[PDB]
Write an enzyme that holds these catalytic residues in place. Structure first.
Site, PDB file in Angstrom:
ATOM      1  N   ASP B  25       0.802  -1.212   0.000  1.00 51.42           N
ATOM      2  CA  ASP B  25       0.000   0.000   0.000  1.00 51.42           C
ATOM      3  C   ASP B  25       0.847   1.279   0.000  1.00 51.42           C
ATOM      4  O   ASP B  25       1.369   1.730   1.009  1.00 51.42           O
ATOM      5  CB  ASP B  25      -0.925  -0.021   1.185  1.00 51.42           C
ATOM      6  CG  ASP B  25      -1.911   1.130   1.177  1.00 51.42           C
ATOM      7  OD1 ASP B  25      -1.865   1.926   0.205  1.00 51.42           O
ATOM      8  OD2 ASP B  25      -2.667   1.085   2.148  1.00 51.42           O
ATOM      9  N   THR B  26       0.905   1.858  -1.192  1.00 53.59           N
ATOM     10  CA  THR B  26       1.665   3.080  -1.355  1.00 53.59           C
ATOM     11  C   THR B  26       1.007   4.269  -0.703  1.00 53.59           C
ATOM     12  O   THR B  26       1.691   5.278  -0.465  1.00 53.59           O
ATOM     13  CB  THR B  26       1.917   3.377  -2.842  1.00 53.59           C
ATOM     14  OG1 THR B  26       0.699   3.490  -3.543  1.00 53.59           O
ATOM     15  CG2 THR B  26       2.765   2.262  -3.491  1.00 53.59           C
ATOM     16  N   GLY B  27      -0.266   4.211  -0.414  1.00 59.13           N
ATOM     17  CA  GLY B  27      -1.025   5.232   0.293  1.00 59.13           C
ATOM     18  C   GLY B  27      -0.882   5.192   1.798  1.00 59.13           C
ATOM     19  O   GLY B  27      -1.469   6.037   2.506  1.00 59.13           O
TER      20      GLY B  27
HETATM   21  C1  LIG Z   1     -13.153   0.935  -1.743  1.00 58.40           C
HETATM   22  O1  LIG Z   1     -12.155   1.929  -1.950  1.00 58.40           O
HETATM   23  C2  LIG Z   1     -11.416   2.254  -0.878  1.00 58.40           C
HETATM   24  C3  LIG Z   1     -10.482   3.297  -1.079  1.00 58.40           C
HETATM   25  C4  LIG Z   1      -9.639   3.696  -0.073  1.00 58.40           C
HETATM   26  C5  LIG Z   1      -9.766   3.130   1.166  1.00 58.40           C
HETATM   27  S1  LIG Z   1      -8.618   3.517   2.466  1.00 58.40           S
HETATM   28  O2  LIG Z   1      -8.215   4.894   2.244  1.00 58.40           O
HETATM   29  O3  LIG Z   1      -9.194   3.156   3.712  1.00 58.40           O
HETATM   30  N1  LIG Z   1      -7.302   2.563   2.288  1.00 58.40           N
HETATM   31  C6  LIG Z   1      -7.530   1.139   2.331  1.00 58.40           C
HETATM   32  C7  LIG Z   1      -6.517   0.316   3.179  1.00 58.40           C
HETATM   33  C8  LIG Z   1      -6.621   0.717   4.635  1.00 58.40           C
HETATM   34  C9  LIG Z   1      -6.929  -1.136   2.958  1.00 58.40           C
HETATM   35  C10 LIG Z   1      -6.199   3.020   1.460  1.00 58.40           C
HETATM   36  C11 LIG Z   1      -4.940   3.323   2.259  1.00 58.40           C
HETATM   37  O4  LIG Z   1      -3.831   3.500   1.335  1.00 58.40           O
HETATM   38  C12 LIG Z   1      -5.035   4.569   3.181  1.00 58.40           C
HETATM   39  C13 LIG Z   1      -5.064   5.896   2.440  1.00 58.40           C
HETATM   40  C14 LIG Z   1      -5.254   7.053   3.380  1.00 58.40           C
HETATM   41  C15 LIG Z   1      -4.168   7.830   3.784  1.00 58.40           C
HETATM   42  C16 LIG Z   1      -4.308   8.765   4.781  1.00 58.40           C
HETATM   43  C17 LIG Z   1      -5.545   9.041   5.364  1.00 58.40           C
HETATM   44  C18 LIG Z   1      -6.659   8.341   4.907  1.00 58.40           C
HETATM   45  C19 LIG Z   1      -6.507   7.338   3.930  1.00 58.40           C
HETATM   46  N2  LIG Z   1      -3.865   4.615   4.070  1.00 58.40           N
HETATM   47  C20 LIG Z   1      -3.897   4.308   5.353  1.00 58.40           C
HETATM   48  O5  LIG Z   1      -4.850   3.919   5.925  1.00 58.40           O
HETATM   49  O6  LIG Z   1      -2.689   4.432   5.955  1.00 58.40           O
HETATM   50  C21 LIG Z   1      -2.691   4.251   7.376  1.00 58.40           C
HETATM   51  C22 LIG Z   1      -3.230   5.536   7.983  1.00 58.40           C
HETATM   52  C23 LIG Z   1      -2.309   6.737   7.968  1.00 58.40           C
HETATM   53  O7  LIG Z   1      -1.276   6.503   8.932  1.00 58.40           O
HETATM   54  C24 LIG Z   1      -0.121   6.001   8.330  1.00 58.40           C
HETATM   55  O8  LIG Z   1      -0.332   4.929   7.455  1.00 58.40           O
HETATM   56  C25 LIG Z   1      -1.273   3.939   7.789  1.00 58.40           C
HETATM   57  C26 LIG Z   1     -10.793   2.197   1.456  1.00 58.40           C
HETATM   58  C27 LIG Z   1     -11.603   1.804   0.425  1.00 58.40           C
END
Ligand SMILES: COc1ccc(S(=O)(=O)N(CC(C)C)C[C@@H](O)[C@H](Cc2ccccc2)NC(=O)O[C@@H]2CCOCOC2)cc1
Ligand SMILES: [Cl-]
Ligand SMILES: [Cl-]
Ligand SMILES: [Cl-]
Ligand code: NA
Ligand code: NA
Lengths: 99, 99
Positions: B25-27
């Site tokens: 997860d690059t996000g």
């Molecule tokens: C159905 O489509 C979806 C699209 C996105 C999401 S998500 O944003 O919840 N996410 C899914 C993942 C948790 C399975 C994408 C992530 O890339 C998310 C993307 C993201 C980034 C920041 C804030 C909100 C969402 N990142 C994230 O949760 O990172 C955590 C939380 C931040 O703290 C440090 O890293 C850990 C859920 C459903």
């Protein structure tokens, strides 16, 4: 381009006539944009991740220019803390994760 | 490898001698895995995901294999829809995004 992961992989997108910054996110199934108006039909959806679920509006057949590359697909609009380009659009610009 | 994004980029990880599935997860800035036993001390951390902020346990300097690539770094333990490998460890395995 080859984008590093030392920093967040942020790019400029154009959507609905608006320029925005968004995260290229391989962990996101779908694309999620902060509240804005888009034309056409929508339907409600709930999406979930860390911290739980949010309610979004699902707009289909939306064009988005991502770092200069056009692509069409579904865009979810709602109270996301960050704009997210998810896999549904990453595939259309030919993005891959390499190691 | 070169991973396309038509399906979720799920890989096998090894942590604590156990195999688990996780999402590249690059996000995600940080790596977050479901409740498990890890050695040593932990520290508190708040992380904000799509649905809000949650408390997790931060374990530093944990040995973890990701798709066969060795890494040693920080692992957060807490409630998540799926184990996520974030940029802190994607950089250790040499991953980039390309299009
Ligand atoms: C159905 O489509 C979806 C699209 C996105 C999401 S998500 O944003 O919840 N996410 C899914 C993942 C948790 C399975 C994408 C992530 O890339 C998310 C993307 C993201 C980034 C920041 C804030 C909100 C969402 N990142 C994230 O949760 O990172 C955590 C939380 C931040 O703290 C440090 O890293 C850990 C859920 C459903
Ligand atoms: Cl789509
Ligand atoms: Cl392809
Ligand atoms: Cl780390
Ligand atoms: Na539409
Ligand atoms: Na423990």
């Amino acid at each position: 381009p080859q984008i590093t992961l030392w920093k967040r992989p942020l790019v400029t997108i154009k959507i609905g006539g608006q320029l925005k910054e968004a995260l290229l996110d391989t962990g996101a199934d779908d694309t999620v944009i902060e509240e804005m108006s888009l034309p056409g039909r929508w339907k409600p959806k709930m999406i979930g991740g860390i911290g739980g679920f949010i309610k979004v509006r699902q707009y289909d057949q939306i064009i988005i220019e991502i770092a200069g590359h056009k692509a069409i697909g579904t865009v979810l609009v709602g109270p996301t803390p960050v704009n997210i380009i998810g896999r549904n659009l990453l595939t259309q610009i030919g993005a891959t994760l390499n190691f």
